[PDB]
Every structure is written in C-alpha cells, then in structure tokens.
C-alpha cells in the first residue's frame, strides 16, 4: 500500500523504487514525450518509441544552463494503456538538488481510454531559483534528480527516476 499522502511530504529522493514493474497492472506505456519552452517554442527534448536494462525506469537529461532560467515548460506525453479501465491516473513528480526539494508537481491525467493511445499535456511552472543554486546546479551535473510517482485510484502503480545535467 502506497498512496499519494506517502509521497507528498518526502524531503529527499528515494533510495530505491517504491514498486516493481509488475505493479503496472494497467499496462501503461509511455511511447512519446516532448518538452518545450512556452516562451520560445524551442523543443528542449523529444523521444519517440521506434542493453540499458533499466531504460524503462531511469532517464538522464542533458540540458543547457539557460534551462534553469525558464519560466514555464510544456510537456506532451503519449501513452498506451491495456484493456482494464484506468480511473484517476495521477503523477506526483518531485525534483531535488542534493536532496533539497526544488518543487513538486501534481498532475492529473484526463480520462484514459482503455486499449488505446492517449495524450496529455503537463505544464511545469518553475520555482524561483537563487543565483547560488543555479550556479551549483550547473557545476554539479546529475545531483539534480526527480522521482515520478504514478497512481491509479490512489494506489502507486509506477515509479520512474530521472537525473539532470545543465552543463550544455
């Protein structure tokens, strides 16, 4: 049993995944992801489904130092789901620098159609970052990290991790 209240107060990145891949019983699969700067229309990252045996649950981002000065990014995700209905699909995503919380984002997906491709846009409003923090984040790649916790009907069914470089 892991519910939203169990992650909404976390003050550091988790030392392990909080669920196994097998707990994804709704067979949710991200097949496209794109991030864009809402103030320029620049595409900052895009991946599309066409070893790395944990590719499914860890992603590493290479951004530029300008990324940290953005106001707002729009993320578009496409995902398939299996044949079971999915109700109240929700992601809580928490970003830390050296286990100082930067921001937590709480996104509710729209209605998910079973056995189909689905699409959702997430808008990220950046927190205020001090000059000192920005300088540190640039100088220390991959010490910025995030946990993405996915819930269906208030139960954790996926957990993905990421880290970030701003070293350009």
């Amino acid at each position: 049993p892991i519910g939203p209240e169990d992650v909404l107060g976390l003050q550091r990145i988790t030392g392990d995944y909080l669920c196994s891949p097998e707990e994804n019983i709704y067979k949710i699969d991200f097949v496209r992801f794109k991030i864009r700067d809402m103030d320029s229309g620049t595409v900052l990252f895009e991946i599309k489904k066409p070893k790395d045996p944990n590719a499914g649950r860890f992603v590493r981002y290479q951004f530029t130092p300008a990324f940290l000065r953005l106001r707002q990014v729009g993320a578009t995700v496409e995902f398939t789901v299996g044949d079971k209905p999915v109700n109240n699909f929700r992601m809580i995503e928490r970003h830390y620098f050296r286990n100082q919380l930067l921001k937590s984002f709480d996104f509710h997906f729209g209605f998910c159609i079973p056995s189909s491709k689905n699409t959702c846009e997430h808008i990220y409003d950046f927190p205020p970052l001090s000059e000192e923090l920005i300088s540190e984040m640039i100088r220390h790649p991959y010490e910025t990290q995030s946990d993405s916790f996915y819930f269906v009907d208030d139960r954790l069914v996926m957990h993905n991790k990421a880290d970030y470089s701003y070293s350009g």
Binding site: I47, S148, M158
Partner: peptide, 6 residues
C-alpha cells in the same frame, strides 16, 4: 519520468 522508455 514520462521520458523513460524500454
């Protein structure tokens, strides 16, 4: 995390 893919 939505940028993950097998």
């Amino acid at each position: 995390g939505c940028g993950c893919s097998s």
